[PDB]
Amino acid sequence: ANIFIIKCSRETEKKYPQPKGQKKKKIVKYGMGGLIILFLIAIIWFPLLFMSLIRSVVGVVNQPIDVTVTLKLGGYEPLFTMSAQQPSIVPFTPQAYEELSQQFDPYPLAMQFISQYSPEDIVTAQIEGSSGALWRISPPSRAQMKQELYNGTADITLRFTWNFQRDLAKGGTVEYTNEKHTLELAPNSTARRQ
Amino acid sequence: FMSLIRSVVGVVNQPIDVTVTLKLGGYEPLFTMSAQQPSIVPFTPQAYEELSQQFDPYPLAMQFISQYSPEDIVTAQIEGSSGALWRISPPSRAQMK
Amino acid sequence: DKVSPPSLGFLAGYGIVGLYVSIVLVVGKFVRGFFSEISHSIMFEELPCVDRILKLCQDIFLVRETRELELEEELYAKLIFLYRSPETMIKWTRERE
Amino acid sequence: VDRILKLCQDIFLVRETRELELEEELYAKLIFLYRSPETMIKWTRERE
Amino acid sequence: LVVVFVAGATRISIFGLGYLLACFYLLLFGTTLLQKDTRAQLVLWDCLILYNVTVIISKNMLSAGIIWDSICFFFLLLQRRIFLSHYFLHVSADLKATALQASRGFALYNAANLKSINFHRQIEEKSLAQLKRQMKRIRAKQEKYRQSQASVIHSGDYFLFESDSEEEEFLWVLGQATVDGLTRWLRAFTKHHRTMSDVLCAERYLLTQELLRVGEVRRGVLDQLASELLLDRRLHIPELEEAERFEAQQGRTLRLLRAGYQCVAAHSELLCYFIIILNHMVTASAASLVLPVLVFLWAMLTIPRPSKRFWMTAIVFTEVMVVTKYLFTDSYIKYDLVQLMALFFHRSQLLCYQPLQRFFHDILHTKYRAATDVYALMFLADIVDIIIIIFGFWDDQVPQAFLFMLLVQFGTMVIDRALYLRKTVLGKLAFQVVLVVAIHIWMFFILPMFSQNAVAQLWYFVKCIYFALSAYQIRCGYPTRILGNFLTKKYNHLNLFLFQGFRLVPFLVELRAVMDWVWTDTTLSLSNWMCVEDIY
């Protein structure tokens, strides 16, 4: 097959003999050389396109559709609870952006933290002051918590538990975000007397 | 080893939990309930014939009903009465009133 | 803080360019395989006239079809000797007038 | 290698002067020189 | 003058504006101010100190923090004491001498560049004769071989291979040595301006010594050892020999920094361009964008000397810019004042002076150039450029513009190589004038946090180097032998290591031989070209 390629490239010479020393192949140079240079430049360069065009995953905002807050004093019963939704949540307006520019003047870390996020990344949940229910609790447990707060000569914890839940088709591989917060009350302290 | 990794057709997802709530106003959730597979009926081919019947002249509905498997639709039942009371603050009851 | 839709990055900032430079290097030392090494095989590559070899090979096919095996392996003998010695290629690949 | 390197520097020179037929006849001498190994030993000695 | 300007700078513009007018007047006429008379020097200095003691009490009338005013005041009294003194009078006569001798130095520079032009004319004639001898000998041998042939590529025979040689042929000594080598390198760079400064200084010293009573003749000093040479065959003043012995005594780093100052006083223009770029490089969005385009355009195009009037326009523009930035800072004004004071340094050290676009465009095509070609440094600077851009991948907007910039850069490099190979000059000028404004318009969309900016400005600086070398090539203009291996000229082991390095970088051999086979005038195939350049 190599002598055949050579013989065919000889026979396609013999039917069209070329003049000696001239005929310097003007167009075909540009043709094949442009094909080669663009092929090599594309092989060099397109690796950082299918490297780059996979990194265009900047993100989207996660407005929490659920807010839940509970005050749980003692192990006897959760005293206060409530939730709210986007009806009782205010996504912030640029007026609140100017307020956060104002309200945190002399702290530079706070300045950079407030200027970090987008305008539409902070919201303000409202919560009804009154309960939406009663303190439904066993009267045995009510008596035990009463006697602890009266004369139980030890400490007592209160968990304030904020919690939020975003949406899911926005992405995000965790949904029920939260954290507790503890307050400690002494045996027969002032808040214990309250 | 291109093809024998694509044999991941799937399996059915029968919902073990059903919850339904009517929440009128911000004062208190009025109605709530849940149920489990005891109060859920996974569909029988009788319900397949019913879904063939009950949606006759709609061709998109015909194709939607004929799309799924027999065992991909269930029928939850819900108790008409509450399983509890409307426990709510009388302040909030007055405000909703 | 905004949530990345897929978080598919799959790697840290340091230690991914290595893959790209490996790919460019391997493709490079591929493409210098035959565009900057065609010096050793110039003799075989270029022959002004090949007719006295091509006749020999068409006869090798002919005797290969007639089953006279000993002229198969003695034309293969002439072919191997012709290729082995470069000097006798120039004494054998001229043209006529 | 001096008698090949001179030939190649002349191929560059005629390549720059545009006298094409001595480009393709020094390319002819180069191809013939490489094709036959025997004439490389008759052509790549040193002098004294 | 500088301290007064910085006193006018570091405080709020309540009365400091006047001192900018001072650097308008003082620096404009500084040489003439020294060259006038004591009476008017003291008049204007008394006016200035009067305005200073005005403005201090005016800044007391508001109903510590005046320190710059106090120090400049001290400087004005010190200079006034200097300007009274009868010791400075002969330094003033020194400057009178520097007013006289300018035309002789202009003619000396003219003679030196005429010597350069005719040394390059003689080199080109010798090289053309050599190339003609080569082509003669080659054609005579090929005629001999077709002669004894008769007694188209694939026609060779053994009789072409006759042996025809017939025609051809402990740590401190290391430190001192390193700093002496570095000051020797700086001497080697300074040598010509050093010689010019020395001859002019000697002539000035002789004239001043003669100028004890009167001075009236110039050609009478031209023969106190004929018209237009560069020779030194004259007397020996013992004061100058004593000064040379005193400077000779020093041998430590003091001579190193002395030669460094002589270097930065010799080139002078280069650091002007350096600071003109460096002001834009840091914290300059659109203010100093309209200046640098024409630095390239005017300065580097007309002739080797910068255009007569480019400097005046540049200095006036810089002053206008500094005054405009007063809509009422810290580093910005400091860089515009250093740029201004560099411009005036170069203007003082110069001491010599639609119907017109086509004129200098034609003078770019009159062929008086020395024909020096330095492509390897364009291509080296662009390779370093692309290494910097690709390593710069070590918010999320500047990489897309870095990668479109990467593609334009590759295209530009390929086009420049093609342009270099057809020996055309006008296309290189068009490429210059397009690319400079293209990259300066691209100098908007870097920012519509620190690393990205620094690597992008290093990128800008290195392609400013590329534009400067491109204008150098526009000036010198393509010697008629450009086809040779860039890295091959002498067979040293260093050269071998560098060549084996150059064939190690991916995709750089075959790109060279393909762009050479496409754009060079040849009658072979692509494979034939590849075979030739690999045998080579």
Side-chain angles (χ1 to χ4, degrees), chain A residues 1-55 59 64 74-75 78 84 87 91 94 96 106 108 110 119 125 129 132-133 139-140 143 152 154 169 171-172 186-187 191, chain B residues 1-6 10 15 25-26 29 35 38 42 45 47 57 59 61 70 76 80 83-84 90-91 94, chain C residues 5-6 8-97, chain D, chain E residues 1-79 81-204 206-212 214-232 234-368 370-536:
Chain A
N2 178 39
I3 177 172
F4 170 70
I5 295 170
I6 301 305
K7 165 74 157 181
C8 205
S9 184
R10 285 296 179 265
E11 294 295 326
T12 185
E13 180 270 334
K14 280 203 215 305
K15 282 166 38 189
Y16 318 87
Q18 299 315 306
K20 58 179 182 295
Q22 204 255 355
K23 201 260 184 156
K24 54 186 182 291
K25 320 158 177 309
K26 188 52 178 46
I27 292 289
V28 285
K29 271 175 314 174
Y30 283 90
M32 211 176 310
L35 194 148
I36 293 308
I37 56 174
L38 285 291
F39 180 72
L40 277 302
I41 294 316
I43 201 53
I44 291 295
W45 174 64
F46 275 166
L48 270 78
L49 283 197
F50 72 94
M51 204 200 207
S52 162
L53 187 64
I54 310 311
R55 316 170 319 179
Chain B
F1 72 94
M2 204 199 207
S3 162
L4 187 64
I5 310 311
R6 316 170 319 179
Chain C
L8 170 162
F10 176 79
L11 200 54
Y14 201 92
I16 184 71
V17 293
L19 190 136
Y20 158 69
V21 305
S22 70
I23 289 302
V24 48
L25 188 146
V26 55
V27 60
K29 286 166 191 176
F30 170 78
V31 79
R32 217 191 287 121
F34 58 91
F35 278 152
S36 288
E37 204 40 49
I38 176 65
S39 78
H40 315 325
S41 88
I42 305 180
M43 44 189 69
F44 308 82
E45 204 85 329
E46 204 280 316
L47 297 178
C49 182
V50 297
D51 281 306
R52 322 209 209 177
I53 290 174
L54 196 61
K55 193 159 64 52
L56 168 63
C57 193
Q58 169 179 357
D59 290 85
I60 278 178
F61 276 142
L62 280 154
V63 59
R64 184 172 291 166
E65 153 174 325
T66 198
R67 292 173 295 189
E68 299 279 283
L69 320 184
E70 58 278 19
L71 320 188
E72 163 209 0
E73 66 92 10
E74 183 178 2
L75 290 178
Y76 180 72
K78 177 160 153 175
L79 182 77
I80 304 298
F81 187 110
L82 179 165
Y83 264 120
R84 185 155 65 173
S85 78
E87 183 65 13
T88 66
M89 294 204 67
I90 296 306
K91 211 200 285 190
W92 187 255
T93 50
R94 287 279 207 205
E95 69 278 343
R96 306 313 309 121
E97 50 267 11
Chain D
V1 298
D2 281 306
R3 322 210 209 177
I4 290 174
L5 196 61
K6 193 159 64 52
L7 168 63
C8 193
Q9 169 179 357
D10 290 83
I11 277 178
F12 276 142
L13 281 153
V14 60
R15 184 172 291 166
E16 153 174 325
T17 198
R18 292 173 295 189
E19 299 279 283
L20 320 184
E21 59 278 19
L22 320 188
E23 163 209 0
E24 66 93 10
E25 183 178 2
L26 290 178
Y27 180 72
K29 177 160 153 175
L30 182 77
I31 304 298
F32 187 110
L33 179 165
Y34 264 120
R35 185 155 65 173
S36 78
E38 183 65 13
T39 66
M40 294 204 67
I41 297 306
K42 212 200 285 190
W43 187 255
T44 50
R45 287 278 207 205
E46 69 278 343
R47 306 313 309 121
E48 49 267 12
Chain E
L1 300 188
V2 172
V3 70
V4 160
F5 191 94
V6 175
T10 294
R11 276 304 296 165
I12 188 54
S13 64
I14 180 72
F15 309 106
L17 292 306
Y19 306 136
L20 297 74
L21 292 299
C23 63
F24 158 74
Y25 165 65
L26 264 292
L27 280 72
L28 206 59
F29 302 83
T31 298
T32 42
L33 295 177
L34 309 176
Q35 293 293 0
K36 285 191 174 182
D37 204 293
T38 183
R39 291 309 318 276
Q41 292 176 335
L42 270 296
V43 163
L44 57 91
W45 283 127
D46 200 57
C47 199
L48 199 62
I49 61 181
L50 268 187
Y51 167 77
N52 193 31
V53 298
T54 303
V55 61
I56 57 174
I57 320 174
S58 72
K59 288 182 79 57
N60 193 221
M61 301 298 111
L62 77 164
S63 296
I66 311 299
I67 55 156
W68 299 102
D69 292 345
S70 56
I71 48 184
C72 56
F73 165 94
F74 162 85
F75 271 93
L76 292 273
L77 288 299
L78 186 55
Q79 60 92 1
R81 264 289 185 263
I82 295 310
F83 264 85
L84 177 55
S85 75
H86 311 276
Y87 321 97
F88 151 78
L89 301 173
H90 307 274
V91 183
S92 76
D94 165 8
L95 272 300
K96 263 74 194 178
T98 61
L100 281 190
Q101 64 191 100
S103 73
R104 170 154 163 85
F106 162 79
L108 177 63
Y109 185 87
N110 185 85
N113 72 24
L114 195 159
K115 167 156 185 172
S116 68
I117 295 300
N118 189 19
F119 182 75
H120 277 45
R121 285 312 198 207
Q122 168 75 292
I123 286 302
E124 295 323 288
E125 301 140 3
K126 162 181 170 307
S127 68
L128 185 70
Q130 189 289 330
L131 188 141
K132 184 58 82 71
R133 171 161 81 257
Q134 290 299 128
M135 290 288 303
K136 187 262 295 178
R137 183 205 59 170
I138 288 304
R139 225 181 285 103
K141 205 185 291 304
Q142 296 312 105
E143 186 266 9
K144 158 178 300 186
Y145 293 143
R146 46 179 50 200
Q147 160 65 10
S148 173
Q149 160 62 45
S151 293
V152 301
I153 67 176
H154 305 325
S155 74
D157 182 65
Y158 298 147
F159 82 113
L160 290 172
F161 286 86
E162 294 176 350
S163 279
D164 49 20
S165 306
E166 60 170 17
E167 60 156 27
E168 67 265 14
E169 52 273 25
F170 53 95
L171 68 94
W172 302 292
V173 55
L174 321 168
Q176 286 285 23
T178 45
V179 69
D180 275 325
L182 267 193
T183 192
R184 177 261 313 136
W185 187 31
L186 251 57
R187 290 319 280 271
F189 277 156
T190 54
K191 200 201 321 178
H192 198 69
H193 205 303
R194 274 197 288 115
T195 55
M196 202 159 189
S197 58
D198 282 354
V199 58
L200 280 296
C201 202
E203 283 208 77
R204 196 192 324 86
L206 182 166
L207 177 144
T208 52
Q209 296 181 1
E210 180 287 332
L211 180 53
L212 81 174
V214 286
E216 289 77 57
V217 297
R218 31 170 185 162
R219 194 152 261 265
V221 187
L222 280 176
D223 296 69
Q224 276 165 64
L225 73 167
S227 293
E228 318 304 309
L229 310 95
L230 194 142
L231 266 70
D232 43 358
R234 293 183 182 175
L235 260 68
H236 294 272
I237 307 175
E239 158 196 347
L240 275 76
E241 314 157 44
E242 184 66 32
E244 295 139 21
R245 292 150 44 89
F246 164 77
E247 57 88 19
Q249 170 190 356
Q250 176 54 253
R252 288 184 178 176
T253 175
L254 190 176
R255 265 192 181 204
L256 167 79
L257 64 90
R258 174 204 203 85
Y261 177 73
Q262 275 301 112
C263 176
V264 64
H267 296 276
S268 312
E269 62 185 342
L270 275 297
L271 183 158
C272 172
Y273 309 114
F274 185 75
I275 190 170
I276 283 282
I277 297 310
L278 198 141
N279 201 359
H280 197 100
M281 178 179 329
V282 69
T283 74
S285 67
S288 75
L289 196 154
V290 76
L291 178 62
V293 285
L294 55 90
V295 64
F296 297 137
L297 295 174
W298 283 85
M300 321 310 267
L301 271 72
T302 71
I303 76 171
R305 180 174 299 84
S307 187
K308 160 196 173 187
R309 51 176 166 277
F310 158 91
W311 305 104
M312 300 181 181
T313 70
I315 77 176
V316 306
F317 183 88
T318 58
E319 183 178 2
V320 168
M321 281 303 306
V322 80
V323 312
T324 189
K325 282 303 176 182
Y326 272 109
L327 312 157
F328 314 99
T329 55
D330 43 2
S331 292
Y332 310 98
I333 302 182
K334 285 182 166 188
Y335 286 124
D336 290 26
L337 67 99
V338 63
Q339 180 171 286
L340 188 149
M341 167 80 192
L343 273 160
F344 275 90
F345 183 80
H346 185 81
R347 183 178 67 83
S348 46
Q349 195 79 348
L350 162 74
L351 55 83
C352 165
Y353 276 95
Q354 177 94 5
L356 296 161
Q357 306 186 358
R358 200 171 165 256
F359 199 84
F360 82 97
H361 276 167
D362 185 67
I363 198 67
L364 270 291
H365 309 296
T366 56
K367 307 189 191 108
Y368 277 3
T372 189
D373 61 299
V374 291
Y375 183 111
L377 296 165
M378 300 182 189
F379 160 75
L380 183 52
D382 288 333
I383 292 294
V384 172
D385 183 66
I386 302 176
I387 300 308
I388 289 301
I389 197 177
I390 296 313
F391 278 175
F393 264 70
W394 153 82
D395 48 357
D396 47 351
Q397 165 192 41
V398 311
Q400 283 56 20
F402 278 154
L403 299 182
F404 285 90
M405 176 57 51
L406 177 71
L407 189 137
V408 44
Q409 183 63 355
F410 273 94
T412 54
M413 164 280 294
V414 172
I415 207 65
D416 88 53
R417 184 53 191 262
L419 270 202
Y420 175 50
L421 275 286
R422 260 184 87 164
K423 283 206 191 297
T424 174
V425 55
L426 55 86
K428 193 39 169 164
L429 176 63
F431 182 71
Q432 177 88 265
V433 64
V434 64
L435 196 50
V436 57
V437 64
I439 303 299
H440 292 330
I441 288 313
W442 201 274
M443 201 37 83
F444 279 164
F445 316 114
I446 66 170
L447 215 50
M449 171 175 189
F450 182 75
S451 69
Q452 310 314 288
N453 187 87
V455 299
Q457 286 280 11
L458 160 71
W459 176 90
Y460 170 68
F461 168 65
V462 163
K463 286 175 61 42
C464 184
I465 316 299
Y466 168 54
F467 285 112
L469 290 202
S470 74
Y472 203 115
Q473 197 61 65
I474 298 288
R475 206 185 316 285
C476 305
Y478 295 135
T480 182
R481 184 182 155 162
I482 69 179
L483 188 47
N485 177 316
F486 315 131
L487 281 51
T488 291
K489 281 180 190 43
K490 40 184 181 286
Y491 309 159
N492 287 126
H493 160 74
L494 173 76
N495 220 350
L496 175 138
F497 176 67
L498 210 74
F499 191 46
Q500 185 160 2
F502 166 60
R503 282 192 46 245
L504 200 50
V505 173
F507 299 97
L508 214 46
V509 53
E510 187 65 23
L511 260 179
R512 180 181 186 271
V514 162
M515 267 193 293
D516 291 320
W517 169 81
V518 62
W519 278 287
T520 312
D521 293 333
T522 189
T523 67
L524 306 151
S525 88
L526 177 50
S527 69
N528 287 14
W529 198 255
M530 277 193 295
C531 274
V532 168
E533 211 74 26
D534 196 287
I535 288 313
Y536 180 64

